[PDB]
């Protein structure tokens with residue numbers, strides 16, 4: 495997509511933006527680079543703020559791209575890993591009351607294997623039959639030669655449906671860019 499502005503920081507539906515526009519929201523361990531992915535697709539450095547390595551994103555952030563879509567940035571599973579569950583109620587409601595939600599891009603790190611939270615997430619995300627675009631990120635930190643031994647583990651771990659799709663990615667080198675935008679567009683222009 496020949497592709498960039500914030501709109502709001504909703505903590506509940508009584509805040510979600512207006513317009514009834516389409517949205518793709520992200521789910522990911524904390525620090526995984528969800529805030530980064532978002533930026534990588536619409537070509538921004540820190541529109542969605544990134545951080546050294548903490549738990550910087552802390553609210554559902556809506557980013558209207560070309561006034562045609564909505565990327566929604568989300569805190570990592572549980573921000574400060576009680577607050578665990580506090581996190582769910584929110585992502586859940588949303589992913590069960592936001593009809594425009596046109597799919598969830600769940601991002602996991604390629605290097606390691608999906609943490610149960612990721613299987614969990616995906617599971618839930620699947621119980622509601624929400625289309626998902628898994629993203630093996632930070633490819634660039636894995637010897638190009640071993641991206642199969644790593645990305646095979648995911649598929650098995652998250653045992654990803656055949657309807658859903660895994661994609662290798664880099665917020666550094668931008669690898670997986672378009673693939674993302676393609677799948678993301680299948681979901682939008684379905």
Ligand SMILES: Nc1nc2c(ncn2[C@@H]2O[C@H](COP(=O)(O)OP(=O)(O)OP(=O)(O)O)[C@@H](O)[C@H]2O)c(=O)[nH]1
Nearest residue numbers: 525526527528529530544545549550551570632665
């Ligand atoms: N080398 C590398 N670093 C990455 C990559 N993606 C994200 N990072 C680094 O990881 C850190 C956190 O990235 P973010 O995008 O803020 O993380 P996040 O998952 O959105 O974090 P929260 O908003 O707290 O959930 C930063 O220092 C980024 O520069 C990637 O593909 N390669």
Ligand SMILES: [Mg+2]
Nearest residue numbers: 528529551568
């Ligand atoms: Mg984030």
